[PDB]
Design a protein around this ligand. Structure first.
Ligand SMILES: CO[C@@]1(C(=O)Nc2cncc3ccccc23)CCOc2ccc(Cl)cc21
Ligand SMILES: CO[C@@]1(C(=O)Nc2cncc3ccccc23)CCOc2ccc(Cl)cc21
Ligand SMILES: [Cl-]
Lengths: 300, 305
């Protein structure tokens, strides 16, 4: 019993963190086999940042301009190429600690663990969700670029995010490991803003099921609702619409607790209308939306 | 920017987790050098748990009754002894992944990371605090006993907790790595209950400083208070008393933000007597007490491990 925001054990990713230096910029790289992946903005000279021509900047670089450090050992860069917004530095040594891995692109609402790093060194691990506006609400200081988001599939690490940027509101933007940004962001210092964020409705429902599994039932009610009526109410509270796919995904939790999805939807509608009235759900006074249905099943 | 509940990187601890089986019970062990540490209740059946004589049960066991598995390799138990509520199984092989470590006993209010394991396999890592009632509000299913709590100091893992039990309210109890329970708990199936929990006041203040560092300032006020007047108010809201040591430990955050500790205490007093008024601090509608002053400094300064 109990319910915590839980990250994946970070060991398999820590064995991959390296420091990448180019000129005066130092950030983190992900060393997998004989390739170091890192944000391409490491080759930018501050001025370049506004309207960089990355293909042009990269052609002017040599392998000896890139300084890669794995612990107290300098790795030799023997090649460099760019894949979208990620720079790939081929090195002369394959990482002996390379785990079984894959590169996955995730959808909004999906959760993942972040191993925050500075100078190629792991400082902490936390759990995040990809927001509906494609940002993440991370905890990142200057020097954290190249820190990665991942999930673990038994023995396999699925890398889903690499940190590139912090927006003016303090939220963060990044790419998958193929260098494609999540959201309409660009790796340029041009004026950028995240869209208004919304609540991940399917995740809140998953967390209400987690609360029932843990004995918290005060918010339950005798009502049910249509999916259309639920969406009309939820959207006026900045909640994402719930699709039939989300109803289906919540099926196992519904069968486990004996509370139909639309029945739990009517509880969520009531919580949005009344608030908590001094009560908490799983020790929280706000509805939590960073636990997916898969996270709840795994943890409970 | 940003403020998250952050655990220490778990890699140094993952290399130490093993599966310990004795009879029909399987739980986790911590393999350090040539010793595997685990809860001594692994020797118990459902009957023994009611009233166990652990010294008597252990004398009747042989080394071959304990099955230790590190990954897909079976370790040979060549000795067994008990230290308080922890069982120590001497093995024939020293763990090559043994990090620099130490066994430390933490105080209530101190935080640590928990590497939750099942069958000697790490499944998740989370951050928690040792509550003032000596329980932890963890997340543990059956099979998680032997999971450990730790902190990292430079490159040294300080093991501070081993999981043993879940109380009827869903909160958890365990021991340090020398087998001494945190709190008035015992390792027997007998009616047990945690004392009334209180809020870790110094940690709430540390988190209010974290909010100010992140630009959340609405709760700040012009007032200050005496430590005595603050403690009189705080204790009527089930808050732990704030000591001069807590005031001193908050000093670097007070210097960084320009908000004296007793000035922040007057903000906390108002938040208690009046509530948040529909507002949040760091995205939370409740005052968070599981960040120590050291955690806030470490996170708002990027200390690495
Ligand atoms: C070069 O890095 C930038 C950045 O966002 N960095 C950061 C990323 N994370 C946390 C940060 C905390 C504090 C300070 C900067 C942070 C700053 C300039 O504008 C840009 C423009 C584009 C890109 Cl892809 C990055 C960047
Ligand atoms: C050893 O098992 C006990 C236990 O608490 N185990 C658990 C520990 N964690 C999470 C659990 C989740 C769900 C079910 C049990 C959990 C239950 C029987 O009585 C006792 C009595 C004493 C002790 Cl020290 C442990 C125990
Ligand atoms: Cl403290």
């Amino acid at each position: 019993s109990g319910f915590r925001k839980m990250a994946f054990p970070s060991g398999k990713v820590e064995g991959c963190m390296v420091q990448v230096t180019c000129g005066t910029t130092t950030l983190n790289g992900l060393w997998l086999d004989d390739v170091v992946y890192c944000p391409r903005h490491v080759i930018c000279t501050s001025e370049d940042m506004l309207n960089p021509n990355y293909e042009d900047l990269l052609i002017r670089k040599s392998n000896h301009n890139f300084l890669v450090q794995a612990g107290n050992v300098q790795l030799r860069v023997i090649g460099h190429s760019m894949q979208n917004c990620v720079l790939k530095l081929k090195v002369d040594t394959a990482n002996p600690k390379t785990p079984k891995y894959k590169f996955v692109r995730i959808q909004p609402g999906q959760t993942f663990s972040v191993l925050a790093c500075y100078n190629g060194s792991p400082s902490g691990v936390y759990q995040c969700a990809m927001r509906p506006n494609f940002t993440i609400k991370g905890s990142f200081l200057n020097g954290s670029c190249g820190s990665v988001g991942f999930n673990i599939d038994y023995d396999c690490v699925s890398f889903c995010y690499m940190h590139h940027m912090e927006l003016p509101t303090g939220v963060h933007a990044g790419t998958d490991l193929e260098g494609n940004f999540y959201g309409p962001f660009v790796d340029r210092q041009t004026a950028q803003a995240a869209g208004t964020d919304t609540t991940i409705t399917v995740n809140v429902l998953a967390w209400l099921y987690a609360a029932v599994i843990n004995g918290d039932r005060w918010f339950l009610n005798r009502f049910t609702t249509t999916l259309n009526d639920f969406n009309l109410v939820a959207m006026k509270y900045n909640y994402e619409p719930l699709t039939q796919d989300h109803v289906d995904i919540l099926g196992p939790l519904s069968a486990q607790t004996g509370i139909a999805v639309l029945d739990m939807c009517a509880s969520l509608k009531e919580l949005l209308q009344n608030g908590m009235n001094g009560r908490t759900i799983l020790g929280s006074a706000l509805l939590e939306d960073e636990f997916t249905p898969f996270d709840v099943v795994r943890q409970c």
